[PDB]
Design a protein around this ligand. Sequence first.
Ligand SMILES: *[C@@H]1O[C@H](CO)[C@@H](O[C@@H]2O[C@H](CO)[C@@H](O[C@@H]3O[C@H](CO)[C@@H](O)[C@H](O)[C@@H]3O)[C@H](O)[C@H]2NC(C)=O)[C@H](O)[C@H]1NC(C)=O
Ligand SMILES: *[C@@H]1O[C@H](CO)[C@@H](O[C@@H]2O[C@H](CO)[C@@H](O[C@@H]3O[C@H](CO)[C@@H](O)[C@H](O)[C@@H]3O)[C@H](O)[C@H]2NC(C)=O)[C@H](O)[C@H]1NC(C)=O
Ligand SMILES: *[C@@H]1O[C@H](CO)[C@@H](O[C@@H]2O[C@H](CO)[C@@H](O)[C@H](O)[C@H]2NC(C)=O)[C@H](O)[C@H]1NC(C)=O
Ligand SMILES: *[C@@H]1O[C@H](CO)[C@@H](O[C@@H]2O[C@H](CO)[C@@H](O)[C@H](O)[C@H]2NC(C)=O)[C@H](O)[C@H]1NC(C)=O
Ligand SMILES: *[C@@H]1O[C@H](CO)[C@@H](O[C@@H]2O[C@H](CO)[C@@H](O)[C@H](O)[C@H]2NC(C)=O)[C@H](O)[C@H]1NC(C)=O
Ligand SMILES: *[C@@H]1O[C@H](CO)[C@@H](O[C@@H]2O[C@H](CO)[C@@H](O)[C@H](O)[C@H]2NC(C)=O)[C@H](O)[C@H]1NC(C)=O
Ligand SMILES: *[C@@H]1O[C@H](CO)[C@@H](O[C@@H]2O[C@H](CO)[C@@H](O)[C@H](O)[C@H]2NC(C)=O)[C@H](O)[C@H]1NC(C)=O
Ligand SMILES: *[C@@H]1O[C@H](CO)[C@@H](O[C@@H]2O[C@H](CO)[C@@H](O)[C@H](O)[C@H]2NC(C)=O)[C@H](O)[C@H]1NC(C)=O
Ligand SMILES: *[C@@H]1O[C@H](CO)[C@@H](O)[C@H](O)[C@H]1NC(C)=O
Ligand SMILES: *[C@@H]1O[C@H](CO)[C@@H](O)[C@H](O)[C@H]1NC(C)=O
Ligand SMILES: *[C@@H]1O[C@H](CO)[C@@H](O)[C@H](O)[C@H]1NC(C)=O
Ligand SMILES: *[C@@H]1O[C@H](CO)[C@@H](O)[C@H](O)[C@H]1NC(C)=O
Ligand SMILES: *[C@@H]1O[C@H](CO)[C@@H](O)[C@H](O)[C@H]1NC(C)=O
Ligand SMILES: *[C@@H]1O[C@H](CO)[C@@H](O)[C@H](O)[C@H]1NC(C)=O
Ligand SMILES: *[C@@H]1O[C@H](CO)[C@@H](O)[C@H](O)[C@H]1NC(C)=O
Ligand SMILES: *[C@@H]1O[C@H](CO)[C@@H](O)[C@H](O)[C@H]1NC(C)=O
Ligand SMILES: *[C@@H]1O[C@H](CO)[C@@H](O)[C@H](O)[C@H]1NC(C)=O
Ligand SMILES: *[C@@H]1O[C@H](CO)[C@@H](O)[C@H](O)[C@H]1NC(C)=O
Ligand SMILES: *[C@@H]1O[C@H](CO)[C@@H](O)[C@H](O)[C@H]1NC(C)=O
Lengths: 131, 131, 462, 52, 51
Amino acid sequence: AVGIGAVFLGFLGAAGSTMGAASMTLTVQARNLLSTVWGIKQLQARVLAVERYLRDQQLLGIWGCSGKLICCTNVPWNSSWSNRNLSEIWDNMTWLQWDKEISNYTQIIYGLLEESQNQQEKNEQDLLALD
Amino acid sequence: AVGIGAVFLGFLGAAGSTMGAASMTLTVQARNLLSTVWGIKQLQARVLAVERYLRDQQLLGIWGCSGKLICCTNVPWNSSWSNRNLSEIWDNMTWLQWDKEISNYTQIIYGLLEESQNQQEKNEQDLLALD
Amino acid sequence: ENLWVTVYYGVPVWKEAKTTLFCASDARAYEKEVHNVWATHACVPTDPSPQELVLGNVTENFNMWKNDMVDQMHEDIISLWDQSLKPCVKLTPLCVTLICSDATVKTGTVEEMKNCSFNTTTEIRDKEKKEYALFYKPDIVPLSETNNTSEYRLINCNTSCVTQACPKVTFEPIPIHYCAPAGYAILKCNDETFNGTGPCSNVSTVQCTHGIRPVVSTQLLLNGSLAEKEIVIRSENLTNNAKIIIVHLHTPVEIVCTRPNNNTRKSVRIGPGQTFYATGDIIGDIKQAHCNISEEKWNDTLQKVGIELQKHFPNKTIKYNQSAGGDMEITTHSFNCGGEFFYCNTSNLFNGTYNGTYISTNSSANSTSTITLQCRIKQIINMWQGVGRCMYAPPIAGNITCRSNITGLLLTRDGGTNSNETETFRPAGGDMRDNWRSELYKYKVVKIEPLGVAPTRCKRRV
Amino acid sequence: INCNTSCVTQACPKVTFEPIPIHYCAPAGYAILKCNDETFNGTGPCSNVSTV
Amino acid sequence: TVKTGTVEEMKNCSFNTTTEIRDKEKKEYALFYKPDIVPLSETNNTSEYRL
Ligand SMILES: *[C@@H]1O[C@H](CO)[C@@H](O[C@@H]2O[C@H](CO)[C@@H](O[C@@H]3O[C@H](CO)[C@@H](O)[C@H](O)[C@@H]3O)[C@H](O)[C@H]2NC(C)=O)[C@H](O)[C@H]1NC(C)=O
Ligand SMILES: *[C@@H]1O[C@H](CO)[C@@H](O[C@@H]2O[C@H](CO)[C@@H](O[C@@H]3O[C@H](CO)[C@@H](O)[C@H](O)[C@@H]3O)[C@H](O)[C@H]2NC(C)=O)[C@H](O)[C@H]1NC(C)=O
Ligand SMILES: *[C@@H]1O[C@H](CO)[C@@H](O[C@@H]2O[C@H](CO)[C@@H](O)[C@H](O)[C@H]2NC(C)=O)[C@H](O)[C@H]1NC(C)=O
Ligand SMILES: *[C@@H]1O[C@H](CO)[C@@H](O[C@@H]2O[C@H](CO)[C@@H](O)[C@H](O)[C@H]2NC(C)=O)[C@H](O)[C@H]1NC(C)=O
Ligand SMILES: *[C@@H]1O[C@H](CO)[C@@H](O[C@@H]2O[C@H](CO)[C@@H](O)[C@H](O)[C@H]2NC(C)=O)[C@H](O)[C@H]1NC(C)=O
Ligand SMILES: *[C@@H]1O[C@H](CO)[C@@H](O[C@@H]2O[C@H](CO)[C@@H](O)[C@H](O)[C@H]2NC(C)=O)[C@H](O)[C@H]1NC(C)=O
Ligand SMILES: *[C@@H]1O[C@H](CO)[C@@H](O[C@@H]2O[C@H](CO)[C@@H](O)[C@H](O)[C@H]2NC(C)=O)[C@H](O)[C@H]1NC(C)=O
Ligand SMILES: *[C@@H]1O[C@H](CO)[C@@H](O[C@@H]2O[C@H](CO)[C@@H](O)[C@H](O)[C@H]2NC(C)=O)[C@H](O)[C@H]1NC(C)=O
Ligand SMILES: *[C@@H]1O[C@H](CO)[C@@H](O)[C@H](O)[C@H]1NC(C)=O
Ligand SMILES: *[C@@H]1O[C@H](CO)[C@@H](O)[C@H](O)[C@H]1NC(C)=O
Ligand SMILES: *[C@@H]1O[C@H](CO)[C@@H](O)[C@H](O)[C@H]1NC(C)=O
Ligand SMILES: *[C@@H]1O[C@H](CO)[C@@H](O)[C@H](O)[C@H]1NC(C)=O
Ligand SMILES: *[C@@H]1O[C@H](CO)[C@@H](O)[C@H](O)[C@H]1NC(C)=O
Ligand SMILES: *[C@@H]1O[C@H](CO)[C@@H](O)[C@H](O)[C@H]1NC(C)=O
Ligand SMILES: *[C@@H]1O[C@H](CO)[C@@H](O)[C@H](O)[C@H]1NC(C)=O
Ligand SMILES: *[C@@H]1O[C@H](CO)[C@@H](O)[C@H](O)[C@H]1NC(C)=O
Ligand SMILES: *[C@@H]1O[C@H](CO)[C@@H](O)[C@H](O)[C@H]1NC(C)=O
Ligand SMILES: *[C@@H]1O[C@H](CO)[C@@H](O)[C@H](O)[C@H]1NC(C)=O
Ligand SMILES: *[C@@H]1O[C@H](CO)[C@@H](O)[C@H](O)[C@H]1NC(C)=O
């Protein structure tokens, strides 16, 4: 998923391919997010573009992850959201239509991830105080 | 490279010394980056100062590093850029004139670092799925 | 085996949203004088590149008449027009009772202008002085309680705002690029058979769009983009009578307009240095005020319109009648060239029919036969409702010409009935939005949602 | 004399144009350099360079 | 004065204004409340008032 190399097109260069086929190239893709009275609209665009970026970063930083590309966690997947085969979704669907199916339960997942993060940090403190 | 202690001068307090002699003190040095119609220019300066900082942070975050001070990687150094002795450059030159020699091949190095990062993350996934 | 949840950063998902755009222009337009044109003082240079990127598969649903970008252009152009007249203001007379007589010239007389004796203030607010200037007949109204043919008043003063444009600005339609800030992307539908809405499939992505020309225009559209291969006819309801239909032509048909010589622009100063210009005498003889259009190009172009329009209609005929009356701002075609404004009458263009019996006119035995139209020249412009549409235009130095490459038509169908198998089209005007909507239908802007979640067998090591 | 052109405006009787000293600071990300060489002859290699 | 009697708290004041054309003045009238008009005069001239 890295054979393009010459990437100046952002995430949009992989659209339409399978989700498995886009597991890489996320480096350059992410980079494209940041690179008279008229000055008021010209300025406002720059400030809100930053505000969007940081809030997305908070979501990753809140529940304990770095290495923005891919973050796995320990919360088990509740099959009641899809009841579908993994390989069928992962190889047949691209990111486009996948979003339109999981976009209803996003808030549920965010909550569980936050709870899990607190459980782990405290667990570390007990194991730290042993040494 | 840490004997100053009283650092309220930023990076500029170490200029002229050898690159080896400035390997530390980067903590306080980095801190100095962030600490009517006239309001328009007064505001614009603050927003562009932030925009400069984050894009530099992206470059570090894109190819997988934290601990902003010093980041070593696994890409081998291609001697065709310098063909010079390490100790000669590292002890005789300060950062000033060093930049003026390596500033031509910066884009090449950034590309290789990005490719290396993707290779490592995927390698982890295979070794993760073994356990 | 078991499944857990993984979050991904960098996922290509698009969503619809409203935002603003970036104004930019080519570098050769920024080394000129300030406000010559407004882009020089207003926008930022950019690169017309990168390379348009075509997507693997994807399916998208554009809609010409559901797009905020078009209204945004309208707001920007109206806003900048008002801002351009703030540092260039006149408040002085030009409203005093004007005494007038039949306009005469060194070689004869003229019927379309009047020579009007004035009553103004000198540079010192103690004295009035005598003066004269010439004006076009349609911009002066005989304000009187009776038939007093010696008491006239400048048409515009019924309300206000007689302001004057600067003699150092030009309204040449410099092309404008629309870019989007980071976090968004622009999509372009390349399907030339695209019939207004629904599943585009050749969808390319762009970071910054193509050139567009801010031309003010009515029924006949002047410089612009070209069609790909053949005539394209867009429409909304068709059935319904109150809608406007867009006809995109694969011509272009040559058209040229001109006017005769004038002597100069008298420089008159009122009070504290408020210089203004007015049309003075005219040398030598006096003529029109006309536009020329090649006949043989017009003929087959107007016929080709029939062969494509008949795609939606079974066995019904196309007819062409004059516009629904009203004053000149509605029926007559208005456009700008070289700082002058013309209002032309198009009777000789839209008279005829098409019944399916297509007749190609051959051979090109005589290309000299052309069509000719009459025009008028105003000076009070009432362009846009809410922009301070009150500009008093100055005249310019001598005889000027204008050559244009006419690309499309704005038509509307008459609301006829009683076995109307001879459906007729009238010329109709409309908001400038409709012209820019015809130029800007290819482009849409969406939001990037870079975060996504998917199931996987991966798990975090404790 | 002034009315040949315009703008006869009048200054306020509550303002003064005393040259109050002004400081020039730079926002973060930049720095100011000051050349202390009193024999500095307009251009070229300063060596007593301080930072501000 | 009013069609049915008079009023003590207002005055009817004859005006001297400019027409829509800056060449002529015209006659007009409006009514005002007593406390918003002051008799600007050097003497007891009850026929010269100012807003
Ligand atoms: C383009 O050139 C062609 C040459 O064929 C024109 O064809 C001529 O068009 C006129 C006007 O449509 C025709 O005369 C008319 O005949 C109809 C009845 O069929 C009648 O109702 C009208 O009053 C008029 O007399 C004419 O017969 C036809 N042929 C020639 C040689 O004149 C065509 O009209 C031109 N473009 C336009 C505007 O149609
Ligand atoms: C002022 O008025 C004169 C008269 O309308 C205009 O001069 C004329 O310009 C037109 C357009 O150039 C001439 O037609 C063409 O001339 C070109 C010249 O190279 C020739 O290449 C063409 O095939 C055709 O002959 C027209 O004959 C000409 N007359 C003269 C005396 O040259 C002029 O354009 C007007 N505009 C200004 C601002 O001067
Ligand atoms: C427009 O009317 C004015 C008013 O008469 C004319 O101005 C006078 O022209 C005559 C002859 O050219 C001179 O004797 C006068 O001295 C002019 N008056 C002033 C105030 O200069 C003018 O000629 C007319 N112009 C046109 C084109 O009709
Ligand atoms: C001032 O404005 C009024 C309208 O706001 C104009 O009055 C009309 O005059 C036109 C012809 O000029 C007539 O067709 C209309 O019937 C009249 N009334 C209306 C409703 O417009 C008037 O012409 C304007 N001109 C002045 C008074 O200088
Ligand atoms: C463009 O094509 C679409 C279909 O892709 C046309 O949609 C029509 O929509 C009306 C709404 O009731 C339907 O009743 C028609 O049946 C649709 N067409 C078909 C074949 O189903 C749309 O009109 C076309 N646009 C134009 C104006 O050409
Ligand atoms: C108005 O301005 C003009 C110049 O813009 C002045 O005209 C000159 O007057 C001076 C003396 O006052 C002469 O030396 C010049 O030769 C005249 N012409 C020029 C080119 O300046 C005029 O004085 C000004 N004063 C007025 C008219 O009130
Ligand atoms: C300041 O010193 C510099 C040299 O440090 C002078 O530079 C001169 O530049 C011209 C350009 O052709 C040379 O030809 C001279 O030979 C230079 N001087 C020497 C000694 O080489 C510069 O002029 C001095 N500035 C002033 C104006 O004092
Ligand atoms: C206010 O004073 C004016 C001035 O006389 C009155 O206006 C006149 O009223 C009379 C009778 O109503 C008319 O004959 C005149 O034609 C009016 N003058 C004008 C210029 O129209 C007015 O009636 C007074 N109004 C009040 C309420 O006192
Ligand atoms: C369209 O989908 C197919 C599925 O195999 C894919 O192979 C093809 O590469 C996609 N589009 C393009 C042109 O890549
Ligand atoms: C016109 O202006 C002149 C300047 O002399 C002034 O005398 C005159 O009264 C004004 N109107 C008439 C009546 O000419
Ligand atoms: C899509 O558009 C591009 C634009 O050049 C075109 O070249 C291509 O042919 C179109 N798609 C197909 C199916 O070829
Ligand atoms: C069309 O382009 C031409 C060619 O330069 C320019 O002359 C003309 O002004 C533009 N047309 C209009 C509407 O002015
Ligand atoms: C306009 O078009 C829509 C779609 O065909 C149709 O439903 C509607 O009936 C048309 N207008 C009217 C008022 O019929
Ligand atoms: C346009 O409508 C008028 C109404 O009388 C009609 O007389 C005329 O013939 C129509 N069509 C043409 C050919 O002008
Ligand atoms: C328009 O032109 C035609 C041809 O000169 C003429 O018959 C008609 O009176 C003109 N006026 C309008 C506004 O129709
Ligand atoms: C309309 O077309 C006919 C074709 O003969 C032409 O005679 C007439 O001048 C044109 N104008 C009118 C009034 O129809
Ligand atoms: C008009 O179309 C022709 C076709 O060759 C083109 O060469 C010319 O540039 C166009 N003129 C303008 C000014 O658009
Ligand atoms: C450099 O400038 C400082 C300013 O006080 C001065 O004290 C010092 O003497 C100068 N450098 C040298 C060589 O002393
Ligand atoms: C009031 O206005 C009128 C309008 O005729 C004017 O004639 C008059 O002199 C002004 N003052 C007086 C004295 O009425």
